[PDB]
């Protein structure tokens, strides 16, 4: 099969030396053959592996030969194709099917809240940053932006010692200004709180280099003209720039949706394992993404390794794709 | 230099002061991290910002020494250096792949033209807002039934890593092609006019035009690849292997935390900080 | 070296751009195209280069066929408006890519660029890059690329839309010095008409993709064949005049004016496929109209409109009974009152007859310059 | 209402832009700012719209000093090279956003709205946005804001630049209609000799953010005040001869001509100090040039470059002494071959004298149409 797929990306057959289109894609072939190898390849393996059965029991494809009927039936065949089984346990199992509800319902509004706080306090600097009536707008824009350069497992994992609990700097500081212990990973909504604090964290500085860049694309005419009228800061930031500013910025909120939709990596660094459902047949935790719910399913031990049902491509991928039908359909806008 | 009222001066105070307050939380955290790195004790509590400097843990990090601090002496945590190299060698391997596999695309989408452009850009849009979802699982099986085949590719391996990170072409291909398009359109023309032959008029004429953008997206992919953690966690499991980003979690763990270890090591990762700042920036007008 | 542009027509896609263009440049001429639609003309000048597929027709360069010809081998030089400037490599470079990329010999990729140098006023600067120039030098740098490769035809692109005054003055200076010193084939593309009267031994006016006239600027200003080109040539558009036809001899046609006096004019014209009663529009240059003291035809109407120039007065005159304000210039000084009455001369040897489609007649009155 | 400069001056920095600048406005006069490209004419219009601070000096607006008034509080009305039309916003809105950030009464604002839209011929053309507007609707619709607005002095930075030259002749008859029926104090600034002289009833030649001369526009073209005033205006460049003092009499002085003609002849000038022997500067326009029969001054030379441009003939001449050369233009089309000697006449009463230091002595020979108003 891997012998197959590497014989069609070699032999295309595309490259006729004949100066047609062929001379075109012989430019493109190089790169659209590593997508089609690294990206899209694995895509396809895991639609694959959805409508088979591969798990803990059945890793192994047909190698065990030998390590009568010699149990020749279906589930000791280990890699067999069940076919939307998979699929239908998603949903008509409910001993999973509400835990993936809650998750999906978490994961939504954390990319929402983080979407429309990220995208304000971005544009909120940007504006205040371009006033070229500032001071060290350079020393301004390389401190507001530190937390771009800074590497994001880094900081994840500083975040993670800061809110810790059994130790804690953050705790102890709020104790000593006024006692209170916030306890963010045992309590779950401090623990999404946290989360929401630290995702802001991280994604501001992106939003904020966007926005300087279209208030840049944004002409200044307009502001002089709203200023011969007589209109003040407040009034040109809401009837000047912000109209000026959604409409080449839908596409980027859609986008960074779909980035904080599968952020595993701060999911999984920072409190990967937030309280559990206590009562999943599937480990899952309240602070849990779709992504790493999937991730806990397929290689976390106390999971089973049911890489049949860790698929859960048709979900996932499938509103990622209405996604991309959206933001490519924002894109030709205009 | 326009007119302005009085009340310019207090808008002004009120900016100044509300910068001010908000960089001061956002740099509470870094600051933080570089008073616990000097901090003697690694379980931290004490004194919040301590005085003294002990830069024990300094040196544990580097490897220098094993900080004599009573008769047992401390044998370094882990190696970070090495940490730092595998690091480095695969976030090179990584670069340079993307840059050689994601230049002669990008020519080819955005100077040249063809019947298939619309449909090709749209799908190079499709495939490379896709992040890394899912396709861990895919890689695990697949490395696993490709390591008795050909080791040097399959698990707990370099080639699995750099595999899984050449991905990047989709994103800096869009990038290049940027580049490409604020490149003069009338180049190719003129130099087919001269007598080059298209392949000639890419290698002589826009290819050492592209050397700033190369250079760019090799900085941006090589610090992409240092810092990846989900691929490099998932298939790397020999202690002497691991690369950056993932003994950084065996830095904190519930058994022993060491916070004074961990901030030695995270201050030791200033270099990344530096080069984003600056060369990542390209100091362009933002 | 003379290019035969026969039955040539563009269908970029379906709409088609240009007509079925039929010119013929002979050798050493320079021909400017001149119009208002300027990606016609400039994809008519890049089916000349062969950087365009010709849909139909055939391209003759010299005496051969060239329609599908690579674009190296055409033996054209193109000046595109952007320059094409390679910023990388430095000035000489630039200038001899051409002999670099066959049989530079070290010797002649030098002598070249210095000859071109000297004699383009470039020799003190050939060793630095495009990037420090100037906008003047940058099109030296160009022109003496398009010299060292020394082509049959010389093609040049309309940039004037993007230079300055004084830049388009420093090029159609240097230009007018290249056609002088060569005399080879040259083609020049622009927009402006006081650019091609200055610097043409044949004008092409192209409309709609449509060629309109061909020939000498003061042949195209003193008989134009038909009514786009008359409006294009002169900064002030012609006044025109619906007239009315009363009868038609063998060399004249007598015509109706709306004035209220209803004069007829014997005017000298082809008089070719005229029938009476019919309705034409007759036109006077501004420049041309006597004064009414001279003349026997007067034009009294009321004044809009006085614009002193100093060296001429553009006095407009609304003709009562004609929606148009008759263009008057005169030279020095007349102190005319906006809102009075002022009267001009009608010369019929100046009136330019036109038919209800379009054409003109050819006049019959012959005119110093046309040769 | 009338706009006043005293002593303005301008400070970059380092660099002084526009110094010491005297300006009089009367009100209802339209006054029209020309130099060349330098950007001192259309930073004077900023500072006098309040976009740009004057380092020193006085500007009045009617009575009151208004240097470190804020532009709202102007009372001034500006257009810019752009049109600074808001995409967003649609014509109505583009027209009416200071009324509705000043005033809240919308049966007034649709009232303003659609007499300048009748005024201006924006009616039908209201509900659409500026990227479907051309550019003639759009140069309008700012027009229509600016008069909506109603301010006291109207501001035009250079309106007619990004216009064909239909549509601009066009909306150069437009504005002229707009400042014959509004009279409200209009000021204007443009690189067009044409457009200047066409409109303005006083233009400010500016150099270096200098004022070179304030007057009229024939007033200009017949009597400069300098050597660049004097070349500036006229559409082709007024001819230079150097000029030697032989005698001054008491209302004409005498030169000789740098040429083997040794030739001397009375100019009618001021004549006042002038100082004998001393390297003088002579101009006339090309279009002023006589034929050689009815000429007793001739200027022999051979025809360098004949430019027909088929209502006037434009012939270079070059004199065998001085180095440029004589651009001659007249009437009709002039058959005469390149490298042909040709001979051309100096009428005494239209030449001008400039001195070493640039200026110019005034001219005695009274000419038409200066004190038409």
Redesign the interface.
Known sequence: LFAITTLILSSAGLYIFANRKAYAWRYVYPGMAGMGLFVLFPLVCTIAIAFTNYSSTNQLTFERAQENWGDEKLSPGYTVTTGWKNFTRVFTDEGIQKPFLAIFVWTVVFSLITVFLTVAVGMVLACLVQWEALRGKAVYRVLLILPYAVPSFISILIFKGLFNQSFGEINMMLSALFGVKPAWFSDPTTARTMLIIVNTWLGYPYMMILCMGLLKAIPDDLYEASAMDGAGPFQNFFKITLPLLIKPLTPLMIASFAFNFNNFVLIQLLTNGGPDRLGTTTPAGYTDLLVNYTYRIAFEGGGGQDFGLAAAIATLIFLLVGALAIVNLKATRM | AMVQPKSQKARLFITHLLLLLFIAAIMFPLLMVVAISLRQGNFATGSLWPEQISWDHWKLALGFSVEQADGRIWPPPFPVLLWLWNSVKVAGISAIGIVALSTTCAYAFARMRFPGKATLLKGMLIFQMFPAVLSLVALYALFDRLGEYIPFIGLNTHGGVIFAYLGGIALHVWTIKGYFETI?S??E????????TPW?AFRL?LL??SVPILAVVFILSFIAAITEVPVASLLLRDVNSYTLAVGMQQYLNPQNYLWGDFAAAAVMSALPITIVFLLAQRWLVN | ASVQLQNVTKAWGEVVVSKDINLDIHEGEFVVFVGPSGCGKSTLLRMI?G?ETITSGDLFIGEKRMNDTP??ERG???V?????????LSVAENMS??LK??GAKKEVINQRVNQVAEVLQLAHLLDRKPKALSGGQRQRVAIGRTLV?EPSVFLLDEPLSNL??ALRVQMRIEISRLHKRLGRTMIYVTHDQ?EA??LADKIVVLDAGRVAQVGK??EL??YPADRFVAGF???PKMNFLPVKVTATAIDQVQVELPMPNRQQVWLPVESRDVQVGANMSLGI?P?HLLPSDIADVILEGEVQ?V?????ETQIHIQIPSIRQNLVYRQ???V?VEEGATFAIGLPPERCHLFREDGTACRRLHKE??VA
Do not use: C, K, W
């Open positions: 003069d009338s180049l023309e003129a130099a087919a006019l001269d007598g080059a000639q004429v050492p035009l | 280069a950087l674009p190296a054209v030089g193109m595109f408006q952007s320059y094409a400037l390679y910023p990388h890519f051409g990329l066959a490769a300055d005054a006081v009267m200055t600027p003061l200003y003193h040539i002169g900064s240059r420049e409109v614009e002193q120039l100093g060296n030279n020095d000084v102190l110093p310059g």
